[PDB]
Amino acid sequence: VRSSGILYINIYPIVNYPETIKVSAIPYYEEFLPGKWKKRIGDLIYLYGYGIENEFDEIDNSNALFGKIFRKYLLDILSENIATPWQLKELGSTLRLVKEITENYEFSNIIKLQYELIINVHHWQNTNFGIIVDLKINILDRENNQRISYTKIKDKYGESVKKKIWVSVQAFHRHLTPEGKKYATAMRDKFNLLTGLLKEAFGSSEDEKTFSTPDGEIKIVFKPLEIVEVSNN
Ligand SMILES: [K+]
Ligand SMILES: [K+]
Ligand SMILES: [K+]
């Protein structure tokens, strides 16, 4: 006798995107500063999105080049749609966004806690795209904004601060209640926290969010991808 189930994963799918995009190829010179709206592929740089200046060609999603360009294009568009109070931490092969935790916690005067969303593009079955999103909570010494270990918190501020911060961090991850206890919806709440912070970071007030591009809309659905297996006993 076998079990059946549903798996939710931290991949949020792009359900609509422009299947053809404008590109402009220029010869690759090392002298050109890399940045948003341009991607080197071999001996060419391809401009795309807001990087399109006067002229252009087009590629569609059957082209090998399309995935290479679109992955980067998608993060560049996401980086134009960050909602306050989130801020850009890094845009490279990954997009990282941060928000300071402004909910009350003991010792928030000396220890700063910060959400960090880590966003990577996933590309599968030739034409499917999505974002894989991880969440971290950074623990910072408020007075100097540097990362601080629990060991250093104990050394600098005392054991009582180290213990209260650990409970608060665990509660902000949804591993514990505010009272420092385990609880029956913790694992569900942990995933719902990730989805809710991601929606907030992109200004999403419904399950689906549209982002404008010069090639047409990109639509993401801010629900975890779901995979269902039903066993036949
Ligand atoms: K919060
Ligand atoms: K504070
Ligand atoms: K889904």
Residue numbers in the entry: 15 to 247
From the paper:
Here we focus on the prokaryotic Argonaute AfAgo from Archaeoglobus fulgidus DSM4304. Although phylogenetically classified as a long-B pAgo, AfAgo contains only MID and catalytically inactive PIWI domains, akin to short pAgos. We show that AfAgo forms a heterodimeric complex with a protein encoded upstream in the same operon, which is a structural equivalent of the N-L1-L2 domains of long pAgos. This complex, structurally equivalent to a long PAZ-less pAgo, outperforms standalone AfAgo in guide RNA-mediated target DNA binding.
Comparison of this 172 aa ORF to a homologous sequence found in a nearly identical AfAgo-encoding genetic island present in the genome of a related strain A. fulgidus DSM88774 revealed that it contains a premature STOP codon due to a 2 bp deletion. To study the structure and function of the full-length upstream protein, the restored full-length open reading frame, with the missing TA nucleotides inserted, was cloned into an E. coli expression vector and the corrected protein was subsequently purified by liquid chromatography. We were able to solve its structure by X-ray crystallography in two symmetry groups: P1 (resolution 1.85 Å) and P3221 (resolution 1.4 Å). Two full-length upstream protein chains found in the asymmetric unit of the P1 structure, and a single chain found in the asymmetric unit of the P3221 structure overlap with an RMSD of 0.85 Å (determined using PDBe Fold). We henceforth refer to the full-length upstream protein as AfAgo-N. The upstream protein (AfAgo-N) is the structural equivalent of the N-L1-L2 domains of long pAgo proteins.
